[PDB]
Design an enzyme around this catalytic site. Structure first.
Site, PDB file in Angstrom:
ATOM      1  CG  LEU A 174      46.226  41.220  43.101  1.00 12.57           C
ATOM      2  CD1 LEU A 174      46.235  39.992  43.981  1.00 12.57           C
ATOM      3  CD2 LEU A 174      47.418  41.217  42.148  1.00 12.57           C
ATOM      4  CE  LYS A 192      38.682  48.642  38.790  1.00 13.05           C
ATOM      5  NZ  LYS A 192      39.159  50.051  38.693  1.00 13.05           N
ATOM      6  CG  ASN A 252      30.087  41.736  43.649  1.00 16.72           C
ATOM      7  OD1 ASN A 252      28.896  41.643  43.321  1.00 16.72           O
ATOM      8  ND2 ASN A 252      30.984  40.784  43.397  1.00 16.72           N
ATOM      9  N   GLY A 295      33.826  45.158  46.399  1.00 16.63           N
ATOM     10  CA  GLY A 295      35.068  44.667  46.980  1.00 16.63           C
ATOM     11  C   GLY A 295      36.274  44.854  46.071  1.00 16.63           C
ATOM     12  CB  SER A 296      39.293  46.057  45.858  1.00 18.34           C
ATOM     13  OG  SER A 296      39.702  46.433  47.153  1.00 18.34           O
ATOM     14  CB  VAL A 297      41.532  40.911  45.284  1.00 21.37           C
ATOM     15  CG1 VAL A 297      42.703  40.029  45.670  1.00 21.37           C
ATOM     16  CG2 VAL A 297      40.232  40.204  45.604  1.00 21.37           C
ATOM     17  CE  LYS A 356      35.604  39.933  48.007  1.00 22.11           C
ATOM     18  NZ  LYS A 356      34.922  39.026  47.029  1.00 22.11           N
ATOM     19  CG  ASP A 413      31.118  35.604  38.179  1.00 23.65           C
ATOM     20  OD1 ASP A 413      30.611  35.681  37.039  1.00 23.65           O
ATOM     21  OD2 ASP A 413      31.909  36.449  38.630  1.00 23.65           O
TER      22      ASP A 413
END
Ligand SMILES: CC(C)CS(=O)(=O)N1CCC[C@H](NC(=O)Nc2cnc3[nH]ccc3n2)C1
EC number: 2.7.10.2
Length: 277
Positions: free
Chosen positions: A15, A17, A19, A21-23, A42, A130
């Site tokens: 979905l 990505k 920093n 991290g990824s979702v 996440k 953000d």
């Protein structure tokens, strides 16, 4: 549940990505027969100490938030953070895609819903850091929610701002001047960014009159933007923007944080605007 077992979480696609991290889109499928419900998950891709502490704080923050206008925490798995999944995706793309359906009323409804989410967040002493239409999700045609608390901070009880050591990695055109010059983030820098979301909303996130496209037009990029802003240059009213909406944007863009309206002041005005439109 609140606890999801990894072996039951089945990968489908990415979905997002950022920093480190990824979702992911996953199905939680304990029967293993594809009938399970979908979730967004996440994870971190960095086993370092401060990024894990950040990720852990993110989880605690989202766990303790309860709003119709904030993306829902579902649980964790042991490492991973499990959330409800919103198939419609981000508001930025939705606006670009459905431009011709959505009138000013709707744009105002979304504005109001986001303000409300932010009023709540601020009441929890949480700076999002953000806020941008790419980070807002569409629950349905008439319902949006705030997402990606990856950079969100909790304000200690004795201080209403937060200074950051390292520089930002987000597009510079959403940052308040005090963030640009000093890395100061507050609920009032969130209000600044919110003003850029209003812009985004009333341009329907069109790329040709985007914040970026407009800065580059208004002529080191970060320094130049700061000067523009300090001289009082501001993004111009989106095409066919109602003037009262443009005025609210300009208040969100007041030089000094203390002169920006609060989210609790903004919300009533957007509702009055919505109802009058
Ligand atoms: C990885 C991070 C930097 C970006 S991010 O958070 O992945 N992100 C923000 C919203 C837009 C994109 N998301 C998106 O398209 N669809 C979607 C659906 N349901 C969800 N539930 C929770 C998040 C989430 N995202 C990417």
């Amino acid at each position: 549940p609140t606890i999801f077992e990894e072996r039951h979480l089945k990968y489908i696609s990415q979905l997002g990505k950022g920093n480190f991290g990824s979702v992911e889109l996953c199905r939680y499928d304990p029967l293993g027969d594809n009938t399970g419900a979908l979730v967004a998950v996440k994870q971190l891709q960095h086993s370092g100490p401060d990024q894990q502490r950040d990720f852990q704080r993110e989880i605690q923050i989202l766990k303790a938030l309860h709003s119709d206008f904030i993306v829902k925490y579902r649980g964790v798995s042991y490492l991973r953070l499990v959330m409800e999944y919103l198939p419609s995706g981000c508001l930025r793309d939705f606006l670009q895609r459905h431009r011709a359906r959505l009138d000013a009323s709707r744009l105002l409804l979304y504005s109001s819903q986001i303000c409300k989410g932010m009023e709540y967040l601020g009441s929890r002493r949480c700076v999002h850091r953000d806020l941008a239409a790419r980070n807002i999700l569409v629950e349905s045609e008439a319902h949006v929610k705030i997402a990606d608390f990856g950079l969100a901070k909790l304000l200690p009880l004795d201080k209403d701002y937060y200074v950051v050591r390292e520089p930002g990695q987000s597009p510079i055109f959403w940052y308040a001047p005090e963030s640009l010059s000093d890395n100061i983030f507050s609920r009032q820098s969130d209000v600044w960014s919110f003003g850029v979301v209003l812009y985004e909303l009333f341009t329907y996130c069109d790329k040709s009159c985007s914040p970026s496209a407009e800065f580059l037009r208004m002529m080191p990029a970060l320094s130049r933007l700061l000067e523009l802003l300090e001289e009082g240059q501001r993004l111009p009213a989106p095409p066919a923007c109602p003037a009262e909406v443009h005025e609210l944007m300009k208040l969100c863009w007041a030089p000094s944080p203390q002169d920006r309206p609060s989210f609790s002041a903004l919300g009533p005005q957007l509702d009055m605007l919505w109802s009058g439109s």
